[PDB]
Design a protein around this nucleic acid. Structure first.
Ligand SMILES: O=c1ccn([C@H]2C[C@H](O)[C@@H](COP(=O)(O)NP(=O)(O)OP(=O)(O)O)O2)c(=O)[nH]1
Ligand SMILES: [Mg+2]
Ligand code: NA
Ligand code: NA
Ligand code: NA
Length: 326
DNA sequence: CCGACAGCGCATCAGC
DNA sequence: GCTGATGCGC
DNA sequence: GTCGG
């Protein structure tokens, strides 16, 4: 974290642009710059030096000079003092409450944790659960705990159908010492790109995880994606573990590699890699990698037999999961 | 100078 | 209900 | 806010 001060600043600006200004591209621009700077192996001495990195432009270079000279950014200092901005940024910290809903709650006078707690009947299901576990959801998950959760999920999925294959992706698969949540990619031979010879594949698994009391709440649930809450069990007299966010993504068995590439991230790594793919004349999603006709129409899916094959198509040297934490 | 910015699942909504 | 745009998050 | 055509 040679440039932790600078990256935090850019990150705070990104969150401002997303939650308050509602300018998603400025948000992504700041996140991109913070990312490229975070992996820069030198302690940045100036904005000029930073402007050499891809993603860092004139505006950010100037902010970096101000920050380096004073240790602060007036622009942020003022933002931190604006009541509306502060209210919106706080409210968006509740899962399910986005930029729009946050600004709307303010208009209605709901702008603090206490306000939210006395107005649950005004929150949709997702927001209600986000408020319920407001504190827990901001706690990190130690890898050791992720290892315990993995054992449970994999073992429970096996009990349902020995043919299910569950893989923990996200920051965990990238080797993180702590994760924000758990990401599980699920496959079953009955569900392929050609057919779904069996229904309730995702339902069965969720059902089984709820039965053993691993999954405690549901934020959203569909045929291929589940978003909810889980908790490791605690021993006698032992204090309870915090409730954790968990996402389960069922993907066509024959499209596992594209699926694991996507669910391993990071999100910025995916944005960078997908952007590169385009420049190389391909389009990548969690299911396939396809070429792009002159027109701009995705052609047919290209054969893929490993994560590496995806890298090869776009002429990128393979990068292990551990090196995708952008 | 200026168009584009990765790609998509689920919940919710308005219009018909 | 069906359909498509919108909000939100992964 | 940044970048490539
Ligand atoms: O905008 C997004 C968000 C997520 N993703 C993918 C990549 C990411 O690694 C994966 C899991 O989403 P999380 O939000 O859980 N991120 P990650 O697991 O990498 O980090 P964290 O430790 O915060 O959960 O989903 C995208 O492709 N685009
Ligand atoms: Mg995750
Ligand atoms: Na640059
Ligand atoms: Na939120
Ligand atoms: Na997740």
């Amino acid at each position: 974290t040679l440039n932790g001060g600078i990256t935090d600043m850019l990150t705070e600006l990104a969150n401002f642009e997303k939650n308050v200004s509602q300018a998603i591209h400025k948000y992504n621009a700041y996140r991109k710059a913070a990312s490229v700077i975070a992996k820069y192996p030198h302690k940045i001495k100036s904005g000029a030096e930073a402007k050499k990195l891809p993603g860092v432009g004139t505006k950010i270079a100037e902010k970096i000079d101000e920050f380096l000279a004073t240790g602060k950014l007036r622009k942020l200092e003022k933002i931190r003092q604006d009541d509306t901005s502060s209210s919106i940024n706080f409210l968006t910290r509740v899962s399910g409450i986005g930029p729009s809903a946050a600004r709307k709650f303010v208009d209605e006078g709901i702008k603090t944790l206490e306000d939210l707690r006395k107005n649950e009947d005004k929150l949709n299901h997702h927001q209600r659960i986000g408020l319920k576990y407001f504190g827990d959801f901001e706690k990190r998950i130690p890898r050791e705990e992720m290892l315990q959760m993995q054992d449970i999920v994999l073992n429970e999925v096996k009990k349902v159908d020995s043919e299910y294959i569950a893989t923990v992706c996200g920051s965990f698969r990238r080797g993180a010492e702590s994760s924000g949540d758990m990401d599980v990619l699920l496959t079953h031979p009955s569900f392929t790109s050609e057919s779904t010879k069996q229904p309730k594949l995702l339902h069965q698994v969720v059902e089984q995880l709820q039965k053993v009391h691993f999954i405690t709440d549901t934020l959203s649930k569909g045929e291929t994606k589940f978003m909810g809450v889980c908790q490791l069990p605690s021993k006698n007299d032992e204090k309870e573990y915090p409730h954790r966010r968990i996402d389960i993504r069922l993907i066509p068995k024959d499209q596992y590699y594209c699926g694991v590439l996507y669910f391993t991230g990071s999100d910025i790594f995916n944005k960078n890699m997908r952007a590169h793919a385009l420049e190389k004349g391909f389009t990548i999603n969690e299911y396939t990698i396809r070429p792009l006709g002159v027109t701009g129409v995705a052609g047919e899916p290209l054969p893929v037999d490993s994560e590496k094959d995806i890298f090869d198509y776009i002429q990128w040297k393979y990068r292990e999961p551990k090196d995708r934490s952008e």
